[PDB]
Amino acid sequence: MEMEKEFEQIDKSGSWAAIYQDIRHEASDFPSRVAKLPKNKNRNRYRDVSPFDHSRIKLHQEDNDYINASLIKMEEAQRSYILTQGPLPNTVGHFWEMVWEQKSRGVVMLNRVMEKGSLKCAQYWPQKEEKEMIFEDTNLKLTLISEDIKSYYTVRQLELENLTTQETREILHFHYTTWPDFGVPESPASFLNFLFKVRESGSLSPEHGPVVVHCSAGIGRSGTFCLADTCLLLMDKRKDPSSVDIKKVLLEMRKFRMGLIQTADQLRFSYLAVIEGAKFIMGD
């Protein structure tokens, strides 16, 4: 069923809450035993958001390999994503260790550091060229190289140095700065423009490790970003684009990380973004 007709059907009948609760009921449940160990309590931002054991990212260290991060591997679309929480004061070095070890090219940030008067993640990158950051627990150095500030997003060039080997890599930071404190955007236009800028940079392509995407919990806005990207790519690839079923794609992604798409409003916004984005993919 053409999603655009499914959309008007749901909207006229006002059944978004009912659709979303069906997804919640059918979603996978897998163990997350490592996340719940006592030694990891200060590595988790939220008590009720944890990576599954089978898909969690492991840090390459013998001490404690735990980070709140998951590998979402989409087999038909041939795309992979790492979804993670906003870093905490005690995990900013782990975060950059993961970026290094997984060979990522890009970091996608979908929140501001402060929202609703409270801190939603640590200030984990440098704000001035001449004031670099050193993470002593993981032996990394991070420098701001350049910054391009636009009306709806900012893109930063960063240099990450492994101080143990003196190798360096360029990392691109894509920061969507205008998601509202409450609710979802009225139009998907600026979010879609942002997704296309990430794509054009190479950060989503198979010659690099998986992109790292986060918000505060790494499931809501972050789930919207990967769900829209994968659905538009599948509409590119298939003989029949109307066969792409966004509810089925979302349930496939929820095999790899719990809770993706946190509200019925985010589900509706994901439909809207895919519908409007297709009017570039299909030839408009």
Is residue 49 within 8 Å of 228, Cβ to Cβ? no
Active site residue 215: yes
- The answer to whether 158 and 144 are in contact (CB under 8 A) is yes
- Which residues share a beta bridge with 160? 142, 169
Q: Is residue 91 a contact partner of residue 43, using CB atoms and an 8 Å limit?
A: yes
8 Å CB contact between 229 and 270: no
| Residue 244 near residue 282 (C-beta atoms within 8 A) | no
β-pairing verdict for 106-109 and 167-176: parallel
Residue type, 152: Y
* Residues 110, 220 contacting (CB under 8 angstroms): no
Question: Which residues are part of a known binding site?
Answer: 181, 215-221, 262
- Please give the annotated binding residues for substrate, written as ranges: 181, 215-221, 262
Give the whole-angstrom CA distance, residue 176 versus residue 249.
24
Give this entry's resolution in angstroms.
1.7
What residues make up the domain containing 94? 1-284
Number of domains in the chain: 1
How was this entry determined?
X-ray
**Phi, psi (rounded to 5 degrees) for 104:** -70, 145
CA distance linking residue 216 with residue 214, whole number of Å: 7
Within 10 angstroms of residue 172's Cβ, the number of other Cβ atoms is 19
- CA distance linking residue 226 with residue 122, whole number of Å: 23
First to last CA, the chain: 21
